[PDB]
Description:
3 chains, alpha+beta, 2 helices, globular, signaling protein, autophagy receptor, autophagy scaffold, single-particle helical reconstruction
Amino acid sequence: SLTVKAYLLGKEDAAREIRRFSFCCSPEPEAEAEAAAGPGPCERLLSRVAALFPALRPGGFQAHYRDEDGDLVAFSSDEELTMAMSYVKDDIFRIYIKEK
Amino acid sequence: SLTVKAYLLGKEDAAREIRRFSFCCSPEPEAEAEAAAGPGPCERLLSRVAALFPALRPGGFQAHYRDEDGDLVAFSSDEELTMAMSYVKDDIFRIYIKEK
Amino acid sequence: SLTVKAYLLGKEDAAREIRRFSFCCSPEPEAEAEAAAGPGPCERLLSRVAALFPALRPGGFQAHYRDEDGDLVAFSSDEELTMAMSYVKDDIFRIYIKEK
């Protein structure tokens, strides 16, 4: 299991709302194309953040993760998630949620 | 029939979105308590504005109507609607929508 | 794999020597009693620290790990290792080596 921490950013980049959800270490929830048609972790995470942060649009936001440099990188692909977890050594995945 | 015009207000009180819906001249849509349990026009209007203006909360907004003076009066009662229509002579009811 | 960082402490608790070794995520290196006769991780770690820190005795030292409070707890049992790793979220296990 891996708890993912999300940080909501308003206009002054100030923490509006905080919420976390339990995630599986598994690559993807489903295997069939009826349930995985390419993505998996990204589409899963972006789903929870939507229901968790109703303050903004359901799918009208980008999640930005810090890199080795610290800069924000708006991720939106499973390939980018596998990389983002490579940074964190612990079982906590922090990310910066922003509404488009 | 009576078309109700709503004006969405952001932070700078600037018209974000515009949308209208056809309303009935009738007092209330239903008569039974299963369908009218006190309110009628207010609850009906506030319902449409929610589905029409998804940009904000479903029921986390107040509709303000101009008076004889011009000032905004956040209405939220059927008794206030019957009065608001008394101002307009035409078949067009304008109101200022604001998200709480 | 899990890199274990060790910190050598002299008389003034000052970092004398620094050295790291690659460890396996596995419970124990061997299964037979000829190779595991109770311990496993502790006996393995304490073995490397000895060859790595020849400055002191081969088996005349105690390794102290920080707890939730931060205090040092001289560990010397496999049961204590499994717990020590539970603190660190990353893949880096830090410990304070002291010669008896």
